[PDB]
Structure formats: C-alpha cells, structure tokens
Amino acid sequence: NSWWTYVNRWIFSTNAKDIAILYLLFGLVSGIIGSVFSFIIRMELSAPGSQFLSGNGQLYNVAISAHGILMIFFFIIPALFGAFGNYLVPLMIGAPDVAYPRVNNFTFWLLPPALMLLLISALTEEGPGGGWTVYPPLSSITSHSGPAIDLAILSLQLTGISSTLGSVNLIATMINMRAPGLSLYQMPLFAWAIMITSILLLLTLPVLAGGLFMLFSDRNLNTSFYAPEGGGDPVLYQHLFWFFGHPEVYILIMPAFGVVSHIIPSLAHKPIFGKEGMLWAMLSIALLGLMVWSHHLFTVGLDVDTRAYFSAATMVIAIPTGIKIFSWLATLTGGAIQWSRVPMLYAIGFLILFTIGGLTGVILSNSVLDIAFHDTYFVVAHFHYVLSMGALFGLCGAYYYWSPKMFGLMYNETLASIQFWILFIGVNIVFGPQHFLGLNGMPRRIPDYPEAFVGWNFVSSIGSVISILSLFLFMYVMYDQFTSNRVVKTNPYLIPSYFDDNVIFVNEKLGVAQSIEWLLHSPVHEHAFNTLPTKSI
Amino acid sequence: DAPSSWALYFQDGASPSYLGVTHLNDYLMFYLTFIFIGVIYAICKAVIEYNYNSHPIAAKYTTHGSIVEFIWTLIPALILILVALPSFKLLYLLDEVQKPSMTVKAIGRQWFWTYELNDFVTNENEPVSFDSYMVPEEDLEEGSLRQLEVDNRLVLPIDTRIRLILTSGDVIHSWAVPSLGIKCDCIPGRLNQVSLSIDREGLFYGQCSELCGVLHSSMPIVVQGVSLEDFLAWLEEN
Amino acid sequence: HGVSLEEINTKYNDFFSNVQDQFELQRGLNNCFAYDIVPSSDVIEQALRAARRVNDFPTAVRIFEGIKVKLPTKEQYQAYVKELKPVCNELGIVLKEDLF
Amino acid sequence: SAPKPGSTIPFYINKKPLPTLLYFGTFGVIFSIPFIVVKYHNRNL
Amino acid sequence: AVGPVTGMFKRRIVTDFSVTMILGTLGACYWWFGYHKPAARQREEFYVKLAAEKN
Numbered sequence: 024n025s026w027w028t029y030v031n032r033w034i035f036s037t038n039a040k041d042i043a044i045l046y047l048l049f050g051l052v053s054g055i056i057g058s059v060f061s062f063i064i065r066m067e068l069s070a071p072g073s074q075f076l077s078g079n080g081q082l083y084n085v086a087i088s089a090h091g092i093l094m095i096f097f098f099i100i101p102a103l104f105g106a107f108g109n110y111l112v113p114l115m116i117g118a119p120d121v122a123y124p125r126v127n128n129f130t131f132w133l134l135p136p137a138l139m140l141l142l143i144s145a146l147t148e149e150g151p152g153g154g155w156t157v158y159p160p161l162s163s164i165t166s167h168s169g170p171a172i173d174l175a176i177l178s179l180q181l182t183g184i185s186s187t188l189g190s191v192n193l194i195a196t197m198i199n200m201r202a203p204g205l206s207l208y209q210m211p212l213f214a215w216a217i218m219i220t221s222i223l224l225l226l227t228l229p230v231l232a233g234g235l236f237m238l239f240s241d242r243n244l245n246t247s248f249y250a251p252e253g254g255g256d257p258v259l260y261q262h263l264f265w266f267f268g269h270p271e272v273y274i275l276i277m278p279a280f281g282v283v284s285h286i287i288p289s290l291a292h293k294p295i296f297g298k299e300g301m302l303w304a305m306l307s308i309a310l311l312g313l314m315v316w317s318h319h320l321f322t323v324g325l326d327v328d329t330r331a332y333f334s335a336a337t338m339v340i341a342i343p344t345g346i347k348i349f350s351w352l353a354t355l356t357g358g359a360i361q362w363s364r365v366p367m368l369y370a371i372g373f374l375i376l377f378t379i380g381g382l383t384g385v386i387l388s389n390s391v392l393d394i395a396f397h398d399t400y401f402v403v404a405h406f407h408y409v410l411s412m413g414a415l416f417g418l419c420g421a422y423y424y425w426s427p428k429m430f431g432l433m434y435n436e437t438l439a440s441i442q443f444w445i446l447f448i449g450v451n452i453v454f455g456p457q458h459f460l461g462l463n464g465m466p467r468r469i470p471d472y473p474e475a476f477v478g479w480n481f482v483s484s485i486g487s488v489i490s491i492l493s494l495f496l497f498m499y500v501m502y503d504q505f506t507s508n509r510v511v512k513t514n515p516y517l518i519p520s521y522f523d524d525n526v527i528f529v530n531e532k533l534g535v536a537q538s539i540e541w542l543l544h545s546p547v548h549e550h551a552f553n554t555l556p557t558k559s560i
Numbered sequence: 561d562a563p564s565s566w567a568l569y570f571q572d573g574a575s576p577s578y579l580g581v582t583h584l585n586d587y588l589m590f591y592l593t594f595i596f597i598g599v600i601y602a603i604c605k606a607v608i609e610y611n612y613n614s615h616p617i618a619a620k621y622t623t624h625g626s627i628v629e630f631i632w633t634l635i636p637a638l639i640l641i642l643v644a645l646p647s648f649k650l651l652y653l654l655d656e657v658q659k660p661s662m663t664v665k666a667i668g669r670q671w672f673w674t675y676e677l678n679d680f681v682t683n684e685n686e687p688v689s690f691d692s693y694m695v696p697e698e699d700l701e702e703g704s705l706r707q708l709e710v711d712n713r714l715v716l717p718i719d720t721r722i723r724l725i726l727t728s729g730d731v732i733h734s735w736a737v738p739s740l741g742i743k744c745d746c747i748p749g750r751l752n753q754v755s756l757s758i759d760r761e762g763l764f765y766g767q768c769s770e771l772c773g774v775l776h777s778s779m780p781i782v783v784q785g786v787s788l789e790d791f792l793a794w795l796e797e798n
Numbered sequence: 799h800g801v802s803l804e805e806i807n808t809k810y811n812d813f814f815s816n817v818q819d820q821f822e823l824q825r826g827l828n829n830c831f832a833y834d835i836v837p838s839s840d841v842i843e844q845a846l847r848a849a850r851r852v853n854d855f856p857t858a859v860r861i862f863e864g865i866k867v868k869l870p871t872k873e874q875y876q877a878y879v880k881e882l883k884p885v886c887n888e889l890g891i892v893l894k895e896d897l898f
Numbered sequence: 899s900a901p902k903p904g905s906t907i908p909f910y911i912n913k914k915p916l917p918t919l920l921y922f923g924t925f926g927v928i929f930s931i932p933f934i935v936v937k938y939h940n941r942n943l
Numbered sequence: 944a945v946g947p948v949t950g951m952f953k954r955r956i957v958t959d960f961s962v963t964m965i966l967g968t969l970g971a972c973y974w975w976f977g978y979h980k981p982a983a984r985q986r987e988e989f990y991v992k993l994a995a996e997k998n
C-alpha cells in the first residue's frame with residue numbers, strides 16, 4: 024500500500040526538497056490563469072469601441088484587477104522568492120534542513136485556500152473593482168454591495184502574513200546554520216540577496232497588514248478612518264500603501280539579481296568581478312529603497328519642499344544599479360562565453376531590457392516630468408518592461424539552470440531556444456508601441472480610447488497572441504523534459520580546461536564545483552550534509 | 561492639441577509650462593539615448609566576438625577594480641547632477657504664484673463635470689454654472705471626434721491667467737490636459753489650487769486619469785480660448 | 799595587487815625547471831596562460847624539456863597550439879616557430895597543421 | 899533506510915499513450931477557466 | 944630570447960571603448976541637432992509670425 028507512503032511523502036512531509044517543487048507547480052497554475060486573463064484584456068482593446076463584450080466596464084475592471092493581483096502575488100513572489108531559496112539556501116550555507124520544518128510546511132498551504140477564495144470573490148455579482156491598488160471611497164459600501172472585495176482584502180492579508188511567516192525561518196537558517204569557517208561576509212551573493220529581501224519584506228509587510236485591516240473595517244464597523252466627512256484623509260491611505268509598494272518590486276527583483284550573478288560566472292568560466300563592491304552597493308540599494316515612497320503621489324498636490332525632498336532622492340537609486348550593470352559587463356568580457364546555452368541566453372537578454380526599463384523609470388522620477396505621464400500608459404510601459412523583463416526572465420533562467428538539480432532530467436535545447444526567441448520577440452513588440460501610446464498623452468485603465476490610437480493597439484495585439492504560443496511551447500518542453508528519461512551527471516556545467524588530458528581529467532578532476540549544490544548527485548539525497556563541510560578558517 | 565494617427569512626438573500645444581516641460585524632456589532624452597546605445601553596443605560586442613569557438617582561453621585572473629570603480633561612481637553621478645539641476649530650477653520657477661486674476665471651479669461627482677465662475681457675483685445675483693456631458697455617439701455632429709466632445713463646453717479667455725480651483729464630492733477624480741501640462745487630483749474634502757495660461761485661441765482636449773468606477777472613461781474635458789469681446793458676449797449671454 | 803609582469807615569468811620558469819608530475823605540470827601550465835603574458839623563449843623551451851621529462855607527448859603539441867591561439871598575429875607565431883624549429887626537430891615534435 | 903533516487907520526482911506517473919490526454923485536458927481546462935469566468939458575469943444580460 | 948609579449952587585453956578594451964564612445968556621442972549629437980533646434984526654431988518663427996499678424 025503506497026497510498027499512505029504517497030501522502031506521507033507529499034502531504035505529511037516537511038523536507039525542503041519536496042516543497043519547492045509544489046511551489047513551482049502552484050506558481051505555474053497561477054501564471055497560466057493570469058496569462059489568459061492578460062490575453063483577454065489585451066484582445067478587448069484591439070480596436071476602439073465595445074468588442075467581444077456588451078460594453079461591460081465593471082467586467083473589464085474585474086479582469087484587470089484579477090490579472091494584476093494574481094500575477095503579482097501568486098506568480099512571481101511565491102515561485103521565485105521562497106521557491107528557489109528554501110530548496111537551495113541550505114545547500115549553499117552548509118546545513119541539512121531549514122531551522123523550522125513545521126513552519127516551512129505550513130507556509131505553503133496557506134496559498135491554495137487564498138486562490139480559491141480569490142476566485143470565489145471574483146465570481147460574485149460585482150467583483151473587485153478598485154484595481155491592484157484598491158482605494159477606500161471606491162471600495163466603500165456605496166459602490167460595491169456584496170462579498171466581492173472583502174474577500175480580496177482577506178486574500179491579500181493572509182498571503183502577506185503567510186509570506187512573512189515563510190521568511191522568518193529562512194533568516195534564522197542562514198544566520199545560525201552557517202558552515203564551520205563560513206563567515207557571513209564570505210556568503211554567496213544569491214543568499215545575500217535573498218536574506219536582504221527576507222528582512223525587507225518582514226520589516227515592511229506588517230504595515231500593510233495593519234493598514235489593510237483598518238481600511239477594511241470601514242465597510243463593516245462604519246469607522247471614519249478614511250471617510251471625507253468623517254475626518255479621514257485618503258492621502259494617508261496612499262502613503263501607507265506606497266510605503267510598501269515601492270520596496271515590494273525591489274524585493275521581488277533582487278532574486279533575479281542573485282540568479283543572474285550566479286548564472287554569469289559558471290557559464291562564463293570566470294569569477295564575478297568585484298564581489299565586495301557589488302554586495303555593498305546592493306546593501307546600499309536595500310537601505311535606500313525605503314526612505315523614498317512618495318514618487319507615486321507626485322500629482323496628488325503635496326507641498327513643494329516635500330516634493331523636492333522625495334524627488335531628488337529618486338535619482339540616487341540609479342547609481343548602484345548602473346555600477347552593478349557595469350560590473351556584469353566587465354565580467355562578461357575577457358572570459359569565455361557559451362552564448363548558445365539557454366540560461367546564458369536569458370541572462371544576456373535580461374541586461375538590455377532591465378537597463379532600458381531603468382532608463383524609463385528615471386524618465387518619470389521628477390514632479391516636473393511626472394505631470395505629463397502620471398497615470399498614463401507610459402508608467403504602464405515602464406513598470407511592465409521592468410517587471411516582466413526582469414523577474415520573469417530571472418525565473419525562466421533559474422528554472423532552466425537548476426532544473427536537473429530539482430528532478431534530474433534534460434530538456435530539449437532546440438525547443439527551449441525557440442521558446443526563448445519567440446517570447447523575447449513577443450514581449451518586445453508588446454510593450455514597444457505602448458511607449459508611444461503613453462507619450463501621446465492617453466491615460467491607462469480605459470476599455471475605450473479616442474479613435475486616433477488604433478494602430479499601436481493593433482501592433483500590440485499580435486505580440487500578445489505570440490506570447491500565448493510561447494507559453495504553449497514552454498508547456499510542451501516542460502512535459503517533454505519530465506518524460507524524456509534523459510540522464511544528467513553530477514556537475515553538467517563543468518568542462519575540462521585548455522590543458523586537461525582526457526584521461527587525467529576524467530579520473531583526477533571530477534567532483535569539483537564553484538558551489539556546493541553541484542557536488543551532490545543531481546537528485547539530491549533526503550539527508551545531505553551528514554558532516555559539516557569545513558573550509559580554511 | 562489633439563491625438564493623431566501613428567504619432568511619435570507628444571503634440572503641438574500652447575502653454576508656458578508645456579514648452580518648458582518639452583525642453584526638459586528633450587534634454588533628458590538627449591542624455592539617456594547616449595547611455596542606452598552605449599550599453600546596447602557594449603553588450604552586443606562583448607559577446608559577438610568573444611564566443612567560445614574563438615576565445616578558448618579565459619583571463620580568469622582579473623577581479624580587482626583599481627581606478628575603474630571610482631569612475632563608475634563619479635561619471636554617471638555627474639550626469640545625474642547635470643539632469644537634476646535644470647529640473648530643479650524649472651520646479652522652483654513653477655512653485656511661485658503670479659498675480660491672481662480670477663478663478664474657476666471644477667467639481668465633478670460621477671461621469672459628468674460641473675464648472676462654476678463665481679468671481680463675477682454682482683447685483684444680478686446669477687452665478688454662472690453648468691455641466692459638461694459626454695455626447696452620445698449617435699448624436700455626433702457630422703465630422704466630429706468620437707469620445708472627445710462635450711455638449712456644454714468650457715469657456716476661458718486667452719492671455720488671461722486663471723487660478724483654477726480643483727474639488728470633488730465623490731470618489732477621487734483627476735483633471736488632466738496634456739496640451740497645457742497642468743494636472744492635479746480631484747480629492748474629495750480638500751481643494752487643490754492650480755493655475756493656467758493660454759497663449760493661443762484654440763480648442764484644447766483632455767480627460768481624467770484616475771479610475772473612478774465603471775464609467776471612468778466617459779468624462780472628456782474640453783476648454784477653448786476666446787477673445788475678450790467673445791468672452792464678454794459669452795458671459796452676458798447667461 | 800601582487801606579482802608584476804616579468805616577475806611571474808621568472809617564477810614560472812623557475813617552477814618549470816623542476817616538475818616531475820604530469821598533474822602539476824598541467825596545473826602550472828594552465829595558470830601561466832592567463833596573465834596575457836606570452837611565454838619567452840626560455841620559458842617555452844623549459845616547458846618542452848619538462849614535458850619530455852615527465853614523459854607526455856600531446857602536451858608538447860598542445861603548447862604550440864595554445865601559443866598559436868593566444869598570439870595576436872601570424873607574424874609573431876612565424877617568428878616563434880622559426881626560432882624554435884631546431885628544438886622541435888631535436889625532440890621530434892610535429893605541428894598540428896602538418897600532423898593532419 | 900538508504901534509498902537512491904531514480905531521478906524521478908514528477909508528483910504523478912507519466913508515460914506516452916494514456917497520460918498525454920489527461921495532462922492536455924488539465925492544461926486546457928485551467929487555460930479556459932477565465933472563459934467561464936467572463937461568461938458568468940454576462941449570463942442574465 | 945624574445946621575452947614576454949603582453950598588452951593584447953588592454954589594446955582590445957581600449958579599441959572597444961573608443962568605438963562605443965564615438966558611436967554614443969555621435970548618436971547623441973544627431974538627436975540634439977535634429978529634434979531640439981529645428982522644432983524650437985520653427986516654433987519661434989511661427990510665434991513671431993503670429994505676433995506680427997496680431998496687429
């Protein structure tokens with residue numbers, strides 16, 4: 024009877040390896056639903072006027088809000104921040120298991136009920152209509168009558184508290200379970216980044232918890248927390264929300280930084296340039312990304328001195344990121360490059376998209392400049408061309424780079440490269456025309472638009488269609504990899520140097536890697552690190 | 561002033577702040593195009609020539625920054641100062657208030673816009689107010705622009721500066737016009753004070769941006785300049 | 799910083815003066831070809847003598863292949879082969895382009 | 899217990915003829931959910 | 944007795960830096976001379992014509 028063994032190995036199991044795979048699967052099943060939502064909303068705006076629908080604006084609001092919320096909180100955060108950390112951080116720190124296995128098991132299972140209740144909420148008579156950033160007066164019982172947005176508030180609350188509970192054990196694990204002789208300074212860059220995101224998320228999210236609960240209480244207890252007649256100021260709500268929203272994207276994108284800084288050296292066979300400078304600049308970014316929050320409130324009408332104070336500091340964020348990009352550029356040159364490898368392809372494509380997105384972000388960090396682009400399609404282009412080009416590319420590269428370690432299989436290089444090229448072209452021709460659409464002075468979140476905009480929407484729709492074929496090809500390649508029984512060696516990314524004999528290398532050179540995870544067999548043991556690896560003190 | 565087809569630039573407008581905004585945008589774009597093309601060429605060239613089949617030996621023994629990290633810290637920061645300064649003096653020019661002349665009110669509840677000119681209250685005791693409404697598609701005048709016209713169009717004289725008053729009594733709205741480059745938030749309870757100055761005598765277009773429910777996209781805003789005699793005739797007409 | 803340009807040349811010549819193990823020879827030979835420093839005549843000649851001593855043939859031809867790959871132009875490689883021909887003929891070394 | 903993994907952690911058995919239809923049907927329904935979602939809001943209309 | 948021959952890495956990086964610098968500078972110069980000056984000059988000419996036609 025393997026059924027008891029089945030459910031003990033999967034449900035009543037607390038091993039880190041058996042949980043990250045479920046993290047990836049949950050991320051995938053959220054991402055497919057989100058991609059179809061995005062496809063339907065982009066197909067709505069193919070041409071001006073009501074199209075495929077009876078002009079249902081509330082339905083369009085539900086669609087955009089659902090796409091945003093589910094793809095920002097059910098696709099990227101749970102499938103990148105903790106999915107590739109809980110599996111891999113114990114391997115690089117020198118520990119056999121996380122500090123608290125039971126909380127690690129608990130954190131994962133708070134998400135499925137969140138997804139079901141979010142779907143139920145979206146399946147109400149009205150559904151959430153405040154968008155990704157819901158606002159009190161719109162959310163007020165005056166507009167919505169029913170259990171539509173309350174469940175969305177609850178889902179955000181519980182997902183946030185689960186993510187906070189899913190990050191308490193990680194910090195303890197990587198602060199106390201360090202290897203003998205592994206100073207915190209000598210820690211690998213990826214775990215450095217993941218710990219920075221963990222501490223930032225835990226420090227900031229409680230504020231969201233409290234603010235969201237007090238805002239939600241307005242619908243039931245009739246509190247005057249944000250009522251215009253009750254003495255409440257919604258600018259307080261905006262300040263509370265954007266004390267969280269601004270660093271959230273950084274804590275989402277830092278794992279991409281770490282995975283890129285890990286992918287570049289091994290496939291380049293060259294050590295990373297300036298590790299200490301890079302990590303200290305990233306620490307400066309982490310500390311800096313908190314005191315700037317009011318760039319999302321530029322046209323609300325705050326005072327001149329506050330605007331200058333919180334707009335001047337927006338620029339200084341660029342300097343460490345530019346230093347990081349320059350360091351990666353320097354690392355790429357000189358050393359060998361295998362440009363044909365899929366992780367190398369994704370890492371190379373990440374840099375140009377991230378830097379152009381950063382340039383777009385530095386475009387609109389001025390109160391003098393934001394007035395022409397605030398709440399228009401230009402900010403949509405900026406934030407999309409940063410998010411879906413950095414976090415999605417990092418996730419794809421991490422999957423294609425560490426998949427043999429998760430399972431022990433080989434994918435098809437041809438199909439993977441074709442998928443990468445198709446996805447790159449589609450996402451480049453999707454968010455391209457939106458730059459012009461927002462540069463003309465046309466707002467966002469409008470199912471209908473003035474007639475002199477049809478061409479760029481038509482150009483975007485074809486790329487939106489192409490992205491769906493990219494998704495189909497990725498699904499096919501994942502299935503093929505899962506059922507191809509293609510074996511993998513211990514360290515598939517280790518090759519003999521220019522002066523290694525074919526008989527000396529095979530017998531006196533195997534079992535060497537830049538990181539610990541490649542030392543063990545690709546399907547890792549349940550109980551690894553029986554004895555602690557000891558380095559040079 | 562109005563959107564065109566296959567547009568690449570912003571538009572042709574008329575407002576003292578709009579010209580300065582366009583100038584600053586031109587300078588900032590001149591700044592960033594440099595860095596964008598430089599990084600693109602660097603990424604392309606560092607890989608197209610250094611592939612494995614042509615460079616089987618890697619100079620793995622250079623991982624120290626002697627004088628390069630310092631220049632990395634300075635030069636982009638120099639560019640940052642060079643772009644920050646003009647924006648700073650533009651903002652410090654804009655934050656001042658000129659000599660007030662008259663005010664308008666732009667209160668709007670839901671899917672319609674109400675305007676008031678209560679400066680000219682006198683013995684007649686007839687303050688002027690109306691409501692600008694979305695014109696239906698069927699009743700559009702032959703040759704009209706869909707989704708960008710109103711029935712009771714707003715009227716402001718040219719070359720006269722107005723200290724516009726922004727207020728709302730419902731869910732938050734916004735008051736935007738790309739040609740004039742002036743925007744602020746129709747936040748309920750609190751009034752937002754903004755200015756305006758039209759140089760030409762032409763029809764200007766715009767609408768709200770911050771979503772306010774199902775029909776957030778059904779309140780276009782049209783303001784057109786008029787001469788002094790036309791303005792006086794319009795005022796005495798009602 | 800650490801070693802300068804010529805100091806590592808002298809150090810690696812001194813190291814290759816006495817090597818009895820194939821693994822150590824390959825290790826030092828790898829570590830030498832990473833400083834953008836093309837070995838001098840004494841260094842390459844002593845490396846060839848060491849390869850003869852530790853009794854490994856393909857390392858000798860790999861030396862010339864790697865030097866040809868590392869050198870910037872054909873003229874420097876031609877000068878090197880002209881000045882090192884007698885050695886190769888003395889130790890029975892066959893070049894890649896003439897091997898097949 | 900000292901078992902050696904067979905490099906197979908798929909959460910469910912996979913093979914060519916039969917399981918392909920199940921996998922493709924699951925993919926199709928989880929792709930087409932938004933459809934019924936958009937149809938529900940325009941049922942009584 | 945030829946002696947060590949070095950400097951290839953620095954030569955390559957110097958050449959690549961030169962090409963990148965000149966290409967970026969030329970692109971920026973083209974943008975500055977093409978989009979700003981003609982548009983501003985045309986605006987000034989049109990405004991002068993409008994002021995003349997006013998009276």
Ligand code: HEA
Binds near residue numbers: 348385389
């Ligand atoms: C996904 C991650 C991510 C990242 C990395 C960034 C990066 C940045 N973002 Fe962005 N941003 C978002 C996600 C992100 N943003 C989201 C989601 C929103 C919308 C919020 C919402 O409405 O929900 C948003 C919106 C947003 C706004 C709001 C505009 C509006 O709606 O009115 C502003 C304004 O300041 C801003 C600024 C910046 C800045 C200055 C950076 C900087 O980090 C960029 C720095 C990077 C570079 C500049 C490139 C590298 C640097 C060099 C090559 C050095 C040399 C450069 C020069 C000298 C030119 N972001």
Ligand code: HEA
Binds near residue numbers: 090091102422470
């Ligand atoms: C997580 C960040 C994220 C991501 C990835 C996306 C992805 C996309 N978004 Fe979205 N979007 C937002 C964040 C994001 N968005 C936010 C915050 C808003 C605002 C919400 C609000 O206004 O309320 C928004 C709103 C928004 C709008 C607003 C509608 C309007 O204003 O008119 C539009 C319309 O164009 C849009 C388009 C897209 C498109 C085309 C994609 C993508 O299709 C682009 C290409 C990407 C893919 C097609 C997916 C690839 C996936 C894989 C290959 C699978 C990998 C799986 C694993 C291995 C686990 N987005």
Ligand SMILES: CCCCCCCCCCCCCCCC(=O)OC[C@H](COP(=O)(O)OCCN)OC(=O)CCCCCCCCCCCCCCC
Binds near residue numbers: 187
């Ligand atoms: C987000 C802000 C909300 C408040 C934060 C608290 C969140 C809930 C409490 C979770 C415990 C926090 C860590 C304690 C330290 C610790 O680790 O306890 C140790 C254990 C795990 O470690 P271990 O036994 O493996 O250690 C190894 C020992 N040598 O914890 C637990 O078993 C937690 C107990 C299960 C509770 C989970 C259900 C949470 C309910 C949330 C709803 C109630 C709050 C609602 C708020 C509106």
Ligand SMILES: CCCCCCCCCCCCCCCC(=O)OC[C@H](COP(=O)(O)OCCN)OC(=O)CCCCCCCCCCCCCCC
Binds near residue numbers: 599621622956
């Ligand atoms: C916005 C753009 C403005 C750009 C302005 C910056 C101008 C200064 C930058 C140049 C400084 C570095 C040159 C090396 C000089 C030198 O010779 O350094 C000395 C070392 C020589 O090797 P060694 O240390 O082992 O010598 C040992 C002595 N015994 O070189 C190197 O290792 C170079 C290795 C890293 C450098 C790679 C550069 C990658 C791109 C850099 C940025 C590209 C800009 C793209 C946009 C224009």
Ligand code: CUA
Binds near residue numbers: 768776777
């Ligand atoms: Cu009115 Cu949005």
Ligand SMILES: [Ca+2]
Binds near residue numbers: 070072073471
């Ligand atoms: Ca439409």
Ligand SMILES: [Mg+2]
Binds near residue numbers: 322397398
């Ligand atoms: Mg706004």
